[PDB]
Structure formats: structure tokens, C-alpha cells
């Protein structure tokens, strides 16, 4: 109580716990500043690289939190295709081959 969790996760957990006993968690909307809303991302690497490295890094260590490596700044540190633009799997995996007509015309 008093902690801040993503609304999607909150609704998902409420709908998950409604069964096996009806006691959905009660929540309220909040308006939080940008500095806070970027130091609590679910990726300790982005938060560590952003600001307050000691605090976020050490509390991530205590929580034994795991980064999923699917953000935009997390995939740039490790040197992988950013999940945006030409990097998303919709285009990274597009297969191209000559058409049959032109292939025969070769």
C-alpha cells in the first residue's frame, strides 16, 4: 500500500486475483514527475545509466532485479539493434528474393 505500480500490471493482477477469492487490490491514479518516472523503469540498466547511479544500482542489486534488454537505451549500450525503426523484427527479418518471372528472365 502506497507503492506505485504500472496500471496495466495493476489491472492484470486484479483480474488474476479476482478468482480464487474476490479481493482485488484498490488503486488510485497518480501524477508523477519525469525524473521519478524514468528512474523507476523496469530495466535497471537504463536507470543506472540515467541518473542516481548508486541508489538505483544498489537497490536493483538488493532486489536481484533482472533486465530484459528490450528498451531503446538498454539495447544501445550492449550494441544491438534498437527496437525501433529498421531494428524491429517486422523488418529485421524481412526476406527478399527475385520474382519468378524476372528470375527466369535472367
Amino acid at each position: 500500500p502506497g507503492s506505485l505500480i504500472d496500471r496495466a500490471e495493476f489491472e492484470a493482477e486484479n483480474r488474476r486475483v479476482v478468482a480464487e477469492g474476490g479481493e482485488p487490490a484498490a488503486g488510485r491514479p497518480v501524477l508523477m514527475g519525469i525524473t521519478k518516472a524514468s528512474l523507476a523503469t523496469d530495466s535497471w540498466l537504463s536507470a543506472a545509466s540515467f541518473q542516481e547511479t548508486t541508489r538505483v544500482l544498489t537497490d536493483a542489486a538488493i532486489n536481484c532485479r533482472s533486465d530484459k534488454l528490450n528498451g531503446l537505451k538498454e539495447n544501445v549500450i550492449i550494441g544491438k539493434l534498437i527496437p525501433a525503426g529498421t531494428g524491429i523484427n517486422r523488418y529485421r527479418n524481412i526476406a527478399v528474393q527475385p520474382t519468378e518471372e524476372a528470375r527466369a528472365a535472367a
Binding site: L57, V76, I78, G79, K80
Partner: protein, 1115 residues
């Protein structure tokens, strides 16, 4: 009286000045010479001080010694003292010291006196006290070969400062003080939100003041007696909650010394020693004067008892509470009544100037304090009656302090000389930052402003425009430094409405105490103003109008506010502060050209700023020239003595420019003392010449001169109008290596023999040999290392006894993008008995010069902030040409003028055309009304007649219109430029004329030291950082351009994932990927896929090193 007359070989630079100057400009390099002479005690200082305060003649070192001595043991059985600071003649002259990497110093000898008390005897010697660095004739110390300038610092003078802070949470003003000493303990007498008063000693969690009042020994009844008026003080007295002086003493002891057992004698000694023993609390003479003045305690008493006294403290308290009440003026017992006011910590009365002498004195005092510590400690160990001061004094700490000041300090700045103006302006600079002063991050946004007290003491225009605005400034032309440190300014005192010529120097305090009129006021040739109302500066910086009855002081002349650099901007009063600032900053960046033509339009400041810059060689005593040559000028004096001034030809300045001096006299000339015998880099027959006058047109020409771009004519390349000699210096040292020694020889490991063609028999290249990128300058080899022979080769060599003879070639090669003639090879060897760093056998310098022409992109800028790179250099044929057929040498865009409010470039253009073509006012019917105030011998002027417009009193708009009306024809009957200053220009390409007239004239533009050849860079492969395998950085090495966070954000915004991966993975850190990419491109194959950056692995290892188990989960 036109022209600057009090200089013998003055070119007749007619001037537009309307106001005579009562006071000639001072010795612009006096601010440093006087200070260092004070430190030395030189005779000039002695006799001048006798003229202005003979009561207390004491040099800097004398004062340091007197403060320091005596040095006695705690037991009091002996003492040591110093006296007689003597300076020997300098070991080697200025140029020799500059060349041979030697610090230009002189030995210091100080006589000791080791007095004994138990038996009685005094011991005296002459003690070597280090090689004290010695100031040169201009103001530059030659330290370890280089030339350094100790910039004067701005500091807040120690004393008492009262300030009020508005309580937003309560809307109640709180008044506080900050008694700030030198080398002492801070302490505050403040007021909290409530009706109390707090004391902090060394800033210790506040405390009611009363514990202090009783601690000093003041009873409750007597405290009430002293404060018998303030309700707040009786309220505090009710709230003291402390009875007993010793109780307060021990409470304060516990507060300041927690855990230390309090006791009466200890507290009595401590609280006194904190503030009343001069050993650890000494606000200097300036501080004592400030305290006395602010409290008005002692008037006729001389400067004695620099430390505090209880009377001063209680005076501070009572003044504080009276100010809190709202009193205007206050009277202290045993002291003159003084006003009650808050003190501002930026007003130049409370902001003093630590010049060079005081800084070196402070460093010497620190070193001597360390030395005194050492000597007093070793006194105990050494037995008495068996040691000598020569054996007691250890001079290593003092010389160390001197060395670490002059070298690697924040004020012993590297000399900024590429033209005489820059060298002159680096001196006289006031840097507000350094030890004991605020830094950039600590610097706020109020200390950087222009306080009204800067008038006449610190130029408001000239200042750096980077992250140093306001902090770094320069002294005004007429400003002189007070003996205490404040910055004085001369003023013409007006008496009975008569503006006398009795110059008197005032600091900020006297300035704002009295009332000062403006410089350009119409006196009726006798000291009486025309109009009643004149513009006057009041006490608190206000400007108002006052009748000519209350005016008490007058500025000596206009341009009293500007510095030397800004005084050289013609029509300054038409430019804006931003562009005037830019022009003043850029006048210090021009490279010295080869010809250095004087400006057609300038100021009277060029000549003085040139002869005082120092490089212009000047005859000290008159005489008749005997011999003249490129290398020497030998003058014969009036009586017997002859002097051969040695010219300085092709000497590299600190920033790579040339330092040529050329004679401007012949064998038959007679030269008066103080005459300009020879020129310097940027001086033309005595006066400053930073650039060239080119024909300028102010139209937008085909967009090549678009948005500050400038287009020159190929004439400037053909005729070498704008070309500069740049000398670069390269260095290599052969040193004793682990395997042996390093040798420089023509014999070198495998290389084609043609490169050896230029090298001489002993390595270094030959004089006058052109070199390019990759050429050998010093054939050098070093032992390759431990090497393995083939086993058969090894056994054969053991039979031979042959040496390995391996070596590995590593020779001095010029950096990429360098070429030019070789000037000089300077060789230093241990065999020649020179001073070299330990472990170095050989050290050779090679100078390489290049005549850099003007090319595309080179930065050009006038004097009024019209900077711009060179977009295109058109041929001479396709350039706009007047009806006469003279092409315009440069074309400036017209859209850059109106929106910058720097309309002095246009007026400079007009007056430049008027000067080039001359003029003749038609004095057939008297004179024209607009010429009524024009000085005589300006109604006519022959072609190429140099003129001068002083800064804030110069050619008016009406005079410019009149002079353009009469612009006598060049050769035929034709006025190229009509009365509007514009001209009919013929297009160079289309042939037909431009449908409307164009503004043409002559503008003095310069060649800034931002040449392209020094800027261009390209990398494809180079050295790498060993810590993280990213490419190195900078142009000195190969280096690659940084791709920062913002650039990656832009790439992510585009959506270019692969390019970002390329820039961050295999171009920078993929140590296994870079080689593969090189091979793939060379072979033409497809690019390999990037791997994982090495820097991320470094991050991983470091996180692991912090006891953070970072593991990678493949799934």
C-alpha cells in the same frame, strides 16, 4: 592640437578630437612593473614611496621577513631573525634564458640573526634563499623556458560586511555580518527569524551572542549599560539563560572542542588566541583600515594592531543592532560618527586587486611558514651553542613553493602572445577566479554583471564570451592601482564652477562620496559649463541632471571607461555592446601578416598601445644612427657611448606566430630618446597595425557571401595582402634506455635511401629543406629489444662476438597536414655540458615554417564584430569594379549589418573611402557650418591620409556627410563615390552594371588565428585507448569525432538502427570486429555482423569488481 604630439617619430595621424586630454595615458604596463618592484624593493619604488608616504617604506619581502621574525623556542632560550633582503644580478640574460629552457631568476640572499638567551650571542650570515624568478622588462616571467604572465586577481578585501536578507516565510528583514579576515577564522553576528542575535565562531551551529559578551568579561549590568536603547537586546538579556563568564567560556569550549575537557585557563587562552593573537588571526593592513573606516574608531592613529580588539567587536554588535532598528548615522565612543549602511560585496570599494607582487608575497609567506615550522622543530633536536643558522635554515620548501606557484598554478598563465595587443592585454587583465576566489561553478549570475563602480576601473566591453563572462576583465586605460589594492581613477576637480586641471586619483569610495560629471561636457574654454544641467553620476550609481553648481568632479576624458583593446575600435559609440565586445575579443587574435599596413581609420591608442607593448624597439637615449642592418641597429649617443640594438628576426612566439623586427631608420637619421627605432610583428612605423585595409562592398553577391561568409579577390592571394608566416616547433630526445642508450644517426633500419637524401650526416635534417607529411626530421633509432637469433645464426654470432645490432627505427616525423621550410636546428647534448632532464643524452629542436596564404574557410573579421569565414575567393576578373576599373577586394553581406546594431563598419567604410581619396573642404566662403567645429588642417587631406577618431569623441555623422560631399577626384574628372557614400558598380560576370548604387569603401579587416589548415581533420584508423578500446581523441593524435548522447538520440529518432549499431559497435569498440571490417572492405566482401562492444565488457568487469554479481542469462 591634433595628433598625439608627445612621441618623437609620430606619423602625422590627424585626429577628429574635440576635447583636449588633460592627462596623457599612463604606463600601461605599470600595474605589473610597480607591483614586482614593490616586492623587490627596487629604488624606483623606494623614492616614489618616499614621495607618497615616506613614513612607512617597506618592500614585500621586507614585510614578510619582519612579520615572520623572530623565530623562538617555546622555552624562550633563543630566537632567530631575518633581514637585509638582497638580490644579485640575473644569472643569464632574457633571450639566453628563453632559449636554453632556463628560468630567468636571480639568487636571493637574506641575512640571519640567531640570538641566544641562556648565554648570550647573536649569529649572522648571508643565506642563499633560492633562485627567485625575476620579472622581465615588460611584465612576463621567463619560467622553464616558456613565457608566463601572472594575471592580477580580484578578491573581496578582508573586513566587515553587513547584509540584509528578506525572510520570505515571515516578510521580516534579517541583518547579518561576516567579519572575514586574511588567514583567520570566520565569525557571524546575525539575527534569526525571531528577535534574537546569533554568534558563530568558525561557523559553529549559531549561538546567542551573550555567551560571548560575558566570555569577553562583560557583566549583565554593563551589557545593559552598553545597549540601553534596543528592545531586542534587553529581550535577549532576558533570554540569555547563562550566568557566569566561565560558564559561557566552558560552554563555548565544549561547542568548539567536543570531547575536550573544558577548563578556565584553557578557555581564557583559546578564546583570546582565536581573535587577538596575531599568529593565527591577522586581517592585513587593508583589513584594519577597512574596519576602522566602517566603524570610524581610529582616524589619526597609524596602522598598528592589525588584530581585533573587544572594542571593535562590540562596535560591530552595536552597529548591527542599530542598523536592524533602522538608524541612518551612528556615533561610537572614542570614534568619529559614521553612516549606518549595508555593504555590497561587489562594489569596487570592497573588492580589491591582488596584483603580481602580493600574490608572490603570499606564496613566499606560505613557503617561509613551512620553513619556520621546520626550523623551530629542528631547533629542539640540535644541541645549543653547536649549530649555525646556515645549518638551521632548510630552503627546499621555499623554492618548492615558488616553483609550484610559477609553474602549474591558476594565475601563472601561459603568455598569450601572437600579436603585441594580445600580449599587452593579457597583462592588465583582472581574473576574478583562482585560489582565494570564486570558481566558474561557484560563480553566480550577479558577480558577473557590470556594477556602476566599474566606470574607469574595469572595462565593461572587453571580456571573454565563453564561460568566463564578467569574471575576467581588463583595467581601463587611465586606471591605477592604489597601494592597498583598490583601483583608483583620475579626476579633474572642479572648484567654484571652474574645471581646473588638478588631477586627483579617487577610489570607488571617494568617487561615490562626491558627485562626478560626464567627460564630454562643454566647458567655455575656461572651466565653466555652457548649460546648467549636466549629466552627473550620483552616489549609488544613479545618472541624473544637475545644475553646474553641485558638480564636484569630472572625468579626465572620454574613453576613461574602455580598456586598451576596446579603445582601438573606431566609432565605438555607434556599435552595440555585444558586437563591441566581440570586436575587442577578436582584436587579440589577429596573426601578424608579412606587411602589416597601418589602418587608414584608427585611434590615438594605436601608437601608445604599440610602444608600450614592448616589442617595438625603442631608443632609451637620443643619438645619431651609426649603422643599420637587418640584424642590428647601432646608434651613437651624444657622449661617447654606442649601443647596438640586436634585432629579433624570425623568432617563434608562444602561439606559433612570427616575431620579426625590421629597422625603420637609416645611417644618417638622428633619433630622440623614446623614439621607435624599429617595428615589431604588427606595427607599421610605430603604430599598431593588426590587419589590412581592403576595398569593401556591402551588397549580397550571388549568395557566396551568405550569412557572414566573406568573398575575397584573388589579388589578396596574388599580392600577398593577407598571408602570415607560421613557425611550428618539433622536439625529440634520445635517452638512456633500459637496454642501453638511444642514438640519432643517419644509419637506420630498413627504409628506402631517398629519404636519407635530405638528412645530414648526423641525423637532423639540413637547413632550408622543404618537408611534408611523413618526412624524416631526426633520424633516430632505439634498441629494438631482446631478440632471438636463428640457432645457426646465434652460434655463428657467438663465434664472431658480434653485437646484435638490432635497433628499431623511431624518428621524429611531422604530423599529418604539415609542411614547409626548416628554419633552425637547435641541438643540446651532455657532451656540450648543458642542462638536460635526467636520463636524456640528446635533445634537438627543429623549427618548420610555412607561409600560410589565405584560403577558403579562413576566418576574417573587422574591428566591430563582423566575423566570417571565406566562402569563395573569386578571380580578379569576375569581381565588381568601379568605373575606374578597380575591383572590390571583399564583399560583405548587407543583411548582417542592420540586425546586429554595429553600424560603425558602415561609418568606418565611409571614412576609409574619404581618407583614401582625400578631401578638400571648399573654404571659399568662410567654412561650411558642419565644418565649424572641425579642427584645422582637416579641411584638406591628401590621398592615403591616415586619420583617427577617438573612442567616444570622434567624427560625427554630419562631418562624415560633409567629408563625403567633397571627395576630390582620383585622377580624372570623376567622383566614384557620391555624397551618399555609395557607388555605381559594374558586375564582373554579366558585364552590365548593378541597377542600384552599392556602398563601397575601405575597411580595416584582419586575419584571425582560426585558419582552416589547423582545423581540418580526417580519421579512418589510428591509435586506440588501452583502458577502453574506443578510438583516441583529438587532432594531435589521429582521433575520431565523438558521437555523443545527443547524436545517438538523433539517430534513434530517425529510426536508423543499423547505422547506430555501426557507429557504436564495429567502428569504435568491437576489437575483434574492426580488423574484420578492414579486411572485408579491402577485399570487397560483405560487412561482417557486429559483435559486443569492449566498453560494455569493461562495465561488466567493474560492476563485478564492486561485489555486484552481474551475470548474463542466455535464456
Amino acid at each position: 592640437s591634433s595628433s598625439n604630439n608627445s612621441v618623437p617619430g609620430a606619423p602625422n595621424r590627424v585626429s577628429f578630437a574635440k576635447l583636449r586630454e588633460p592627462l596623457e595615458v599612463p604606463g600601461l604596463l605599470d600595474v605589473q612593473t610597480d607591483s614586482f618592484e614593490w616586492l623587490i624593493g627596487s629604488p624606483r619604488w623606494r623614492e616614489s614611496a618616499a614621495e607618497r608616504g615616506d613614513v612607512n617604506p617597506v618592500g614585500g619581502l621586507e614585510e614578510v621577513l619582519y612579520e615572520l621574525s623572530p623565530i623562538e623556542d617555546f622555552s624562550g632560550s633563543m630566537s632567530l631573525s631575518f633581514s637585509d633582503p638582497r638580490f644579485d644580478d640575473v644569472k643569464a640574460p632574457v633571450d639566453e634564458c628563453k632559449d636554453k629552457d632556463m628560468t630567468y631568476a636571480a639568487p636571493l640572499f637574506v641575512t640571519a640573526e640567531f640570538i641566544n638567551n641562556n648565554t648570550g650571542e647573536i649569529k649572522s650570515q648571508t643565506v642563499f634563499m633560492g633562485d627567485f624568478p625575476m620579472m622581465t622588462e615588460k611584465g612576463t616571467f621567463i619560467i622553464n623556458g616558456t613565457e608566463r604572465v601572472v594575471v592580477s586577481q580580484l578578491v573581496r578585501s578582508p573586513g566587515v560586511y553587513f547584509d540584509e536578507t528578506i525572510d520570505k516565510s515571515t516578510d521580516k528583514t534579517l541583518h547579518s555580518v561576516k567579519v572575514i579576515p586574511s588567514r583567520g577564522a570566520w565569525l557571524e553576528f546575525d539575527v534569526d527569524k525571531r528577535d534574537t542575535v546569533g554568534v558563530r565562531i568558525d561557523r559553529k551551529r549559531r549561538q546567542p551572542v551573550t555567551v560571548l559578551l560575558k566570555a569577553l568579561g562583560w557583566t549583565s549590568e554593563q551589557i545593559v549599560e552598553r545597549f540601553g536603547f534596543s528592545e531586542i537586546m534587553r529581550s535577549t538579556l532576558e533570554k540569555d539563560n547563562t550566568v557566569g563568564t566561565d560558564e559561557a567560556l566552558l560552554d563555548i569550549y565544549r561547542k568548539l572542542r567536543p570531547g575536550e575537557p573544558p577548563t578556565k585557563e584553557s578557555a581564557q587562552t583559546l578564546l583570546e588566541n582565536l581573535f587577538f593573537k596575531e599568529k593565527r588571526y591577522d586581517l592585513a593592513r587593508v583589513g584594519r583600515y577597512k574596519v576602522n573606516k566602517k566603524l570610524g574608531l581610529h582616524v589619526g592613529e597609524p596602522i598598528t594592531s592589525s588584530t581585533l580588539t573587544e572594542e571593535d567587536v562590540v562596535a560591530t554588535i552595536e552597529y548591527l543592532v542599530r542598523l536592524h532598528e533602522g538608524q541612518t548615522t551612528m556615533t561610537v565612543p572614542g570614534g568619529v560618527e559614521v553612516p549606518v549602511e549595508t555593504d555590497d560585496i561587489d562594489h569596487f570599494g570592497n573588492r580589491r586587486l591582488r596584483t603580481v607582487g602580493e600574490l608572490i608575497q603570499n606564496q613566499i609567506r606560505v613557503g617561509m611558514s613551512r620553513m619556520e615550522r621546520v626550523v623551530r622543530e629542528r631547533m629542539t633536536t640540535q644541541d645549543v651553542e653547536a649549530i649555525t643558522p646556515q645549518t638551521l635554515i632548510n630552503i627546499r620548501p621555499v623554492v618548492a613553493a615558488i616553483k609550484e606557484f610559477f609553474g602549474t598554478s591558476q594565475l601563472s598563465q601561459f603568455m598569450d602572445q601572437n600579436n603585441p595587443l594580445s600580449g599587452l592585454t593579457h597583462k592588465r587583465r583582472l581574473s576574478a577566479l583562482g585560489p582565494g576566489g570564486l570558481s566558474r561553478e561557484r560563480a553566480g549570475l550577479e558577480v558577473r554583471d557590470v556594477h556602476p563602480s566599474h566606470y574607469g576601473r574595469m572595462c565593461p566591453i572587453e571580456t571573454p564570451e565563453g564561460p568566463n563572462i564578467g569574471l575576467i576583465g581588463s583595467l581601463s586605460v587611465y586606471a591605477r592601482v592604489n597601494p592597498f589594492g583598490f583601483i583608483e581613477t583620475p579626476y579633474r576637480k572642479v572648484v567654484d564652477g571652474v574645471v581646473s586641471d588638478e588631477i586627483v586619483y579617487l577610489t570607488a569610495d571617494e568617487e561615490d562620496r562626491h558627485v562626478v560629471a560626464q567627460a564630454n561636457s562643454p566647458i567655455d574654454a575656461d572651466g565653466r559649463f555652457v548649460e546648467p544641467r549636466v549629466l552627473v553620476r550620483r552616489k549609488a550609481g544613479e545618472v541624473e541632471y544637475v545644475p553646474s553648481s553641485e558638480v564636484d568632479y569630472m572625468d579626465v576624458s572620454p574613453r576613461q571607461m574602455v580598456s586598451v583593446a576596446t579603445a582601438m575600435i573606431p566609432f565605438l559609440e555607434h556599435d552595440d555592446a555585444n558586437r563591441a565586445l566581440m570586436g575587442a575579443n577578436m582584436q587579440r587574435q589577429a596573426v601578424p601578416l608579412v606587411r602589416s599596413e597601418a589602418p587608414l581609420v584608427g585611434t590615438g591608442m594605436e601608437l601608445r598601445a604599440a610602444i608600450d607593448a614592448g616589442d617595438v624597439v625603442v631608443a632609451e637615449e637620443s643619438g645619431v644612427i651609426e649603422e643599420v642592418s637587418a640584424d642590428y641597429i647601432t646608434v651613437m649617443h651624444d657622449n661617447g657611448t654606442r649601443r647596438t640594438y640586436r634585432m629579433r628576426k624570425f623568432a617563434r612566439s608562444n602561439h606559433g606566430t612570427c616575431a620579426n623586427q625590421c629597422p625603420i631608420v637609416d645611417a644618417g637619421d638622428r633619433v630622440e630618446a623614446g623614439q621607435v627605432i624599429a617595428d615589431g610583428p604588427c606595427t607599421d612605423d610605430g603604430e599598431m597595425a593588426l590587419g589590412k585595409n581592403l576595398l569593401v562592398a556591402i551588397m549580397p553577391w550571388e549568395g557566396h557571401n551568405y550569412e557572414d561568409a566573406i568573398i575575397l579577390s584573388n589579388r589578396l592571394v596574388e599580392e600577398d595582402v593577407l598571408t602570415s608566416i607560421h613557425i611550428e616547433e618539433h622536439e625529440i630526445d634520445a635517452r638512456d634506455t633500459k637496454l642501453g642508450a638511444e642514438e640519432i644517426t643517419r644509419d637506420i633500419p630498413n627504409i628506402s635511401d631517398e629519404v636519407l637524401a635530405d638528412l645530414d650526416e648526423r641525423g637532423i635534417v639540413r637547413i632550408g629543406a622543404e618537408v611534408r607529411d611523413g618526412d624524416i626530421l631526426v633520424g633516430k633509432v632505439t634498441p629494438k629489444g631482446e631478440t632471438e637469433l636463428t640457432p645457426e645464426e646465434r652460434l655463428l654470432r657467438a663465434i664472431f662476438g658480434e653485437k646484435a645490432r638490432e635497433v628499431r627505427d623511431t624518428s621524429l616525423k611531422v604530423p599529418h597536414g604539415e609542411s614547409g621550410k626548416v628554419i633552425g636546428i637547435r641541438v643540446f647534448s651532455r657532451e656540450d655540458e648543458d642542462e638536460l632532464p635526467a636520463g636524456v643524452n640528446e635533445l634537438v629542436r627543429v623549427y618548420v615554417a610555412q607561409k600560410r596564404k589565405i584560403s577558403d574557410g579562413d576566418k576574417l573579421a573587422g574591428r566591430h564584430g563582423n566575423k566570417g569565414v571565406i566562402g569563395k575567393i573569386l578571380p580578379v576578373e569576375d569581381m565588381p569594379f568601379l568605373a575606374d576599373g578597380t575591383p572590390v577586394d571583399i564583399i560583405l553581406n548587407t543583411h548582417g549589418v542592420p540586425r546586429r546594431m554595429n553600424i560603425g563598419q558602415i561609418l568606418e567604410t565611409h571614412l576609409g573611402w574619404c581618407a583614401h581619396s582625400g578631401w578638400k573642404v571648399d573654404a571659399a566662403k568662410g567654412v561650411p557650418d558642419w565644418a565649424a567645429r572641425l579642427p584645422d588642417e582637416l579641411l584638406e587631406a591628401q590621398p592615403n591620409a591616415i586619420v583617427s577618431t577617438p573612442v567616444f569623441d570622434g567624427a560625427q555623422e554630419a562631418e562624415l556627410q560633409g567629408l563625403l560631399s567633397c571627395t576630390l577626384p582620383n585622377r580624372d574628372g570623376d567622383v566614384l563615390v557620391d555624397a551618399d557614400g555609395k557607388a555605381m558598380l559594374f558586375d564582373g560576370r554579366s558585364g552590365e552594371p548593378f541597377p542600384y548604387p552599392v556602398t563601397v569603401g575601405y575597411m580595416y579587416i584582419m586575419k584571425l588565428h582560426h585558419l582552416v589548415d589547423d582545423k581540418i581533420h580526417a580519421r579512418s584508423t589510428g591509435p586506440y585507448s588501452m583502458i577502453t578500446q574506443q578510438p583516441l581523441g583529438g587532432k594531435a593524435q589521429f582521433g575520431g569525432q565523438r558521437f555523443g548522447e545527443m547524436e545517438c538520440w538523433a539517430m534513434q529518432a530517425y529510426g536508423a538502427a543499423y547505422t547506430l549499431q555501426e557507429l557504436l559497435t564495429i567502428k569504435s569498440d568491437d576489437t575483434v570486429g574492426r580488423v574484420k571490417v578492414y579486411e572485408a572492405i579491402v577485399k570487397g566482401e560483405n560487412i561482417p555482423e557486429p559483435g559486443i562492444p569492449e566498453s560494455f565488457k569493461v562495465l561488466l568487469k567493474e560492476l563485478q569488481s564492486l561485489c555486484l554479481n552481474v551475470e548474463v542469462l542466455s535464456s
